[PDB]
Amino acid sequence: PLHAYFKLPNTVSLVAGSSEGETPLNAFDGALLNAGIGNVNLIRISAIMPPEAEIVPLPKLPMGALVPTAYGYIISDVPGETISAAISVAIPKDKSLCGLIMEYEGKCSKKEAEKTVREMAKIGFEMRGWELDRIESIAVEHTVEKLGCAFAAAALWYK
Amino acid sequence: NPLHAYFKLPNTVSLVAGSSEGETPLNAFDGALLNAGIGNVNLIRISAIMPPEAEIVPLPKLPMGALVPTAYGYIISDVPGETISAAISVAIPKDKSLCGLIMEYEGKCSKKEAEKTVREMAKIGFEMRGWELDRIESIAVEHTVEKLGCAFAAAALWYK
Amino acid sequence: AEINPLHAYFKLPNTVSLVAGSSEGETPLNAFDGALLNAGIGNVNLIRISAIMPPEAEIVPLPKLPMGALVPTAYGYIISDVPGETISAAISVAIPKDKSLCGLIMEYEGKCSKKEAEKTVREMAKIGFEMRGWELDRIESIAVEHTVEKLGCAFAAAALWYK
Numbered sequence: 001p002l003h004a005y006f007k008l009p010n011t012v013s014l015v016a017g018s019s020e021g022e023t024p025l026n027a028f029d030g031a032l033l034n035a036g037i038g039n040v041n042l043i044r045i046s047a048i049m050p051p052e053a054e055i056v057p058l059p060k061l062p063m064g065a066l067v068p069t070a071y072g073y074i075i076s077d078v079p080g081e082t083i084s085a086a087i088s089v090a091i092p093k094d095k096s097l098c099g100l101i102m103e104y105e106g107k108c109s110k111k112e113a114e115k116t117v118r119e120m121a122k123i124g125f126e127m128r129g130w131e132l133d134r135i136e137s138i139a140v141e142h143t144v145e146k147l148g149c150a151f152a153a154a155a156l157w158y159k
Numbered sequence: 160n161p162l163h164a165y166f167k168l169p170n171t172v173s174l175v176a177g178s179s180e181g182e183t184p185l186n187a188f189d190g191a192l193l194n195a196g197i198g199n200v201n202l203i204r205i206s207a208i209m210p211p212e213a214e215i216v217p218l219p220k221l222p223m224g225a226l227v228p229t230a231y232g233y234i235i236s237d238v239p240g241e242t243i244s245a246a247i248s249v250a251i252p253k254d255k256s257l258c259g260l261i262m263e264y265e266g267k268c269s270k271k272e273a274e275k276t277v278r279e280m281a282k283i284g285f286e287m288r289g290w291e292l293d294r295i296e297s298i299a300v301e302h303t304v305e306k307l308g309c310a311f312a313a314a315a316l317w318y319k
Numbered sequence: 320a321e322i323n324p325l326h327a328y329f330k331l332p333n334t335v336s337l338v339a340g341s342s343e344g345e346t347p348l349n350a351f352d353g354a355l356l357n358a359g360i361g362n363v364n365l366i367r368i369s370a371i372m373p374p375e376a377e378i379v380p381l382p383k384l385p386m387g388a389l390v391p392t393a394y395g396y397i398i399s400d401v402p403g404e405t406i407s408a409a410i411s412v413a414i415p416k417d418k419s420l421c422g423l424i425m426e427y428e429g430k431c432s433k434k435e436a437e438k439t440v441r442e443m444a445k446i447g448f449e450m451r452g453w454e455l456d457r458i459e460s461i462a463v464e465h466t467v468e469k470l471g472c473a474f475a476a477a478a479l480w481y482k
Contacts, residue, residue, distance in 0.1 A: 003162075003163075004163065004166060004327070004329070006163075006164075006165035006166060006326060008222060008224045008225055008226070009224070009226070021446075021450075022442075022443075022446050023427075023439075023443055023446070025425060025426065025427070025443060026425075026443055026446045026447060026450070028369075029370075029423070029447050029450070030450055032369065033450065033451070038451075039371055039421050040369075040371060041368035041369050041370065041371045041391060041393075041479075042368070042369040043203060043226075043325065043366060043367070043368060043391070044203075044204065044367070045201035045202065045203060045226065046188075046189075046192065046200075046201055046202035047201065048199055048200060048201045048223065048224045049224060050222075050223060050224025050225075051223050051224060053224065062331060062373075063371065063373065063374050063420070063421040064331055064332075064371045064372060064373025064374060064376070064421045065328070065331060065373075066324050066325065066328065066331070066332075066366075066368065066391050068201060068203070068226050068325065070201075097199075097223065098199050098223035098224050100189070102185060102186075102189075103185065104183075104185070116183075120182075120183055120185060120186055123181075123182050123183075123186050124186060124189050127179075127186070127189070127190055127193060128193065128198075156201075157328075158328060165323065165326050166321075166322065166323060166326050166327045167321035167322065167323060168321040168322075168323060168385075168387055168388065168389065169323065169387075169389075203325055203366060204367070205364040205365060205366060205389070206351075206352075206355065206363075206364055206365035207364070208362055208363055208364045208386065208387050209387065210364075210386065210387025210388075211386050211387060213387065226325045226326070228323075228325065228364055228366070228389060230364075257386065258362050258386040258387045260352075262348060262349075262352075263348065264346075264348070276346075279345075280345070280346055280348060280349055283344075283345050283346075283349050284349060284352050287349070287352070287353055287356065288356070288362075316364070
């Protein structure tokens with residue numbers, strides 16, 4: 001590749017994690033680290049999986065990389081409160097179309113968050129009137145001890 | 160002919176706006192993006208600055224999933240009958256070596272008020288810089304909430 | 320000279336610059352805009368990052384950025400329309416002893432003094448390194464405080480750039 005070819009991300013990786021922290025940002029950083037995406041820069045995106053992009057396990061990312069990432073997170077300082085974050089990726093039957101990435105966060109269980117985010121993806125496809133192939137999702141819940149963060153993401157990268 | 164153009168700074172800006180009801184805030188937001196014509200690309204929220212010599216152009220054909228540097232304003236409301244608006248403006252300088260200022264606004268007001276407000280914000284930015292104004296281009300959108308709606312306005316940066 | 324970090328994903332910033340500023344404004348966005356200008360980073364496109372300084376990146380005074388530049392920036396800001404209210408924003412960059420490791424960028428803003436904001440953000444950076452169990456070389460930080468007259472914004476950032 002003697003000449004860098006412009007391209008849209010072609011991989012999407014679903015990760016999720018949670019962590020306690022002394023401050024909201026430290027808990028967030030902890031959640032990222034727990035999710036396996038803690039030493040890279042997350043560039044928040046509105047969430048669209050580029051056509052022909054493949055869902056793959058999180059690639060080995062260069063530290064400090066500017067990773068276009070669709071994510072949802074929630075931080076709580078209420079002891080005993082269970083918080084969750086979930087990400088869904090609606091995949092089209094028509095491969096020339098894009099996938100839809102939805103995120104959800106709330107004071108609920110992992111199961112509810114995942115169900116809600118998957119439903120949101122479905123709704124997005126209905127709004128577009130696109131044929132839905134399937135929905136891939138991930139979710140995580142965290143029971144706050146003192147200060148915790150639940151985080152779920154779809155990291156877009158290049159294979 | 161310039162190569163690696165996409166690896167350089169965006170040279171176009173497109174003002175788009177839209178609104179939509181949604182079963183959830185994000186679904187409403189997604190609907191507004193779709194209604195605005197940029198629902199199938201990735202919006203990368205930016206602080207809002209039109210690169211010098213860039214041109215305001217109608218929304219180009221964007222590749223789905225594109226990482227579009229976008230300055231935007233949006234408002235979501237679940238209050239039936241409430242009118243919410245979003246507007247975007249870009250102040251273009253007379254001195255073409257200078258950058259354009261992109262301002263975004265949102266609120267519980269009419270399309271007219273949102274646009275007037277966002278235009279003044281762009282003008283003020285130029286006043287703060289002491290830059291001579293060529294013109295201010297803007298667009299606004301209002302949405303009367305039925306159950307849960309989102310009004311959205313954006314300045315999408317892209318390439319020639 | 321021009322670069323879109325979102326497209327040139329393979330080209331990571333190799334410098335980081337701490338800037339801070341504050342400003343009054345007729346609207347929250349105008350105040351925010353005024354703060355960027357006061358911080359010296361007012362005519363560029365800020366792409367917010369989560370806050371990781373790429374390994375081997377050097378802390379340098381903010382370079383002359385071309386207008387409209389897409390600048391990956393870790394930042395914190397606070398806007399207030401309460402007269403007399405003192406607001407602050409601070410940024411810290413924890414630098415590792417092992418240069419092959421990344422630096423951690425923490426941001427903090429609140430209704431407090433410049434001194435408190437900086438102390439807090441510095442502690443946050445220290446905590447980040449302790450959570451990783453990495454050897455901390457030092458913490459570079461900056462803070463700014465603004466006493467709101469009508470509507471003000473305090474802004475602090477770690478702008479990632481190239482050299």
